[PDB]
């Protein structure tokens, strides 16, 4: 089997909603705030080592 | 000298290898052929 990590989606969706709310203070009330994947690097930076 | 670990390939693309090597032992003149397991990230191919 593969090594896997399980995180509850309700809690992660709820916390992620706390971080996105605060970020709007610096960049404006109504702006597109997207989250993306790792854009490159070694295996260390790219994954949750 | 590695042989992929016993697995049914449905893709399972196991990173694990099963490698036998000529390892040293307690005595200098003697040797031993032992095996081990290594993930894909630890070994590279030597042509």
């Amino acid at each position: 089997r593969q090594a896997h990590c399980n995180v509850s989606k309700a809690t992660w969706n709820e916390t992620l909603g706390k971080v996105v709310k605060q970020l709007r203070k610096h960049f404006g009330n109504n702006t597109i705030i997207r989250f993306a994947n790792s854009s490159g690097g070694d295996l260390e930076v790219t994954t949750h080592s | 000298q590695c042989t992929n670990v016993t697995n049914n390939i449905t893709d399972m693309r196991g990173e694990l290898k099963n490698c036998s090597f000529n390892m040293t032992t307690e005595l200098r003149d003697k040797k031993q052929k032992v095996y081990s397991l290594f993930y894909r990230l630890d070994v590279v191919q030597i042509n």
Partner: antibody
Amino acid sequence: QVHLQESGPGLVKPSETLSLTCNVSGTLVRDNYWSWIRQPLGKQPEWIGYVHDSGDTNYNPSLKSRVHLSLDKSKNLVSLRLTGVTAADSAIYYCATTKHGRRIYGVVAFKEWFTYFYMDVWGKGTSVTVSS
Amino acid sequence: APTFVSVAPGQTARITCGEESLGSRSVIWYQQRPGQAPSLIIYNNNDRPSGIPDRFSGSPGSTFGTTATLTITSVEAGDEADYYCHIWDSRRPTNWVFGEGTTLIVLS
């Protein structure tokens, strides 16, 4: 009740195209899975691959190139075709309906499950011997 | 190739079939009476199909390092036949040839 009948010549010269037929009654030929199992005299059976609609068909790796299968909804039959038979093909060819199953030992997100097949209802079969 | 097991009438039978388990298995057992066609007994180990008595029991496929086992307690005369096992091992590739069957014979 399911009435399955296995018809075949029973005697075929070497290096000749063998063809059998499995009559089916009680249920449509397309709804259920079908498989062929041959058995040499004094040995263990041998799965000769299964067949089903929607392109679901796999072959035995040993005789994959020589074996063939087909189906037809109108006549409610199952057909087996084998080209280039030899003396090792002398076996009793059974025709049985097959059911699938899902056995899960892992998360299933990364294909940690596998499908197993079992045949519930069989038929009398036909005794086919290859000899010159 | 064949393996014979003698069992007195009305006593427990022990049937060995297949290699050692390397992964989680889905064992299938079949009954081939003399001259007749192979009939299904057990699918997915202890789980059985309609019309089968409870005397037939399959060893669980969750453990590793052991071989499959079909247990028949208080064997009746009709249970005597040839028994084949179909191994579905997660570590092993697809098996297209059944295992070497075991020939159960009541002394009679």
